[PDB]
Amino acid sequence: GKLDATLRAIVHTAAELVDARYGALGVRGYDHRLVEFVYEGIDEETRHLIGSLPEGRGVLGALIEEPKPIRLDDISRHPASVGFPLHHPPMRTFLGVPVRIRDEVFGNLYLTEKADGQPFSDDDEVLVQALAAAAGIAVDNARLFE
Amino acid sequence: GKLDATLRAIVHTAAELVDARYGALGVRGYDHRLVEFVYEGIDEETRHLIGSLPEGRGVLGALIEEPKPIRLDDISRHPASVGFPLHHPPMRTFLGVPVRIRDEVFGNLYLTEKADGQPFSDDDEVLVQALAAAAGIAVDNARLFEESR
Ligand code: HEM
Ligand code: HEM
Secondary structure, X not given: OOHHHHHHHHHHHHHHHHOEEEXXXXXXXXXXXXXXXXXXXXXXXXXXXXXXXXXXXXXXXXXXXXXXXEEEOOHHHOOOOOOOOOOOOOOOOEEEEEEEEOOEEEEEEEEEEEOOOOOOOHHHHHHHHHHHHHHHHHHHHOOOOO | OOHHHHHHHHHHHHHHHOOEEEEEXXXXXXXXXXXXXXXXXXXXXXXXXXXOOOOOXXXXXXXXXXXXXXXXXXXXXXXXXXXXXOOOOOOOOEEEEEEEEOOEEEEEEEEEEEHHHOOOOHHHHHHHHHHHHHHHHHHHHOOOOOOOO
């Protein structure tokens, strides 16, 4: 539509910008279930194989509690990592930022598997922060929340 | 402090993702002159020989005085077209969107010359809009202007 289409554009744009194989952005509602879930790097066939949508339970729920960008050379190092459900493709390098405006958080933007086992840089972080802010404006524009 | 590197990254990713040969991002000051001019797709002979920075005099200011994106098959069939100074590459397809945040317009981001003479698409314009809004965030964060502080 308009939000979905802009969210998809951001995820695609961020992955390209930071040169990541995969990207997602989830936006969650009042019940903490997703309203918007947009992902890059995986076709519809593997998507259906993965099955359930994420619960945002580990590193990603660290991202929503904190407001902090999370930038990791290996996500399994992080205390709150829970690992991946079967068929989900393996990923180690992780760059995730919150999607936000004012003191409101809507969800997150996250990228994995930077080309060759290269770590994400701070350059990369600032770009993903710029795009996650563009995503905050887009959600706030669409309204969606009280 | 990364502002310039950020904009150069944005312009580069824009041009490539939309298949344009050329792309540029200009931010102007309170005095209507460029503060930042980022461009992609040209050598140094050429850049030196274009000479003078653009004044934002035609289609580029159409984007200035009213937001909304401009997407054209042929630059010269916009009633604002001024043309190009000598040495500047000829450009026919155009895709332009204002760079901005809140009620502030800091500049414009633009692409020309989709490969194969193809025209810019809606999807092309959506992506660029996304990158331009991120560029406005980046200009805003940089506290370059008083309506940021
Ligand atoms: C294509 C880009 C994707 C990226 C960048 C991505 C990222 C991640 C990351 C970093 C984790 C780590 C969990 C942790 O250790 O805390 C994870 C787990 C998980 N992912 Fe993905 N993912 C993608 C695609 C998908 C898709 C398409 C689905 C499902 C339809 C999905 C569903 C899940 C589920 C159910 C988990 C278990 C954790 C949870 O519920 O939060 N992912 N993903
Ligand atoms: C490489 C990416 C570039 C793009 C996409 C681009 C785009 C354009 C476009 C579309 C116009 C026509 C405006 C109109 O006719 O209404 C134009 C004109 C012009 N360009 Fe470029 N340009 C690029 C590079 C440059 C560079 C590097 C310079 C100077 C160093 C320059 C200087 C000018 C000048 C002086 C004009 C005449 C209009 C004005 O003064 O605003 N251009 N350009």
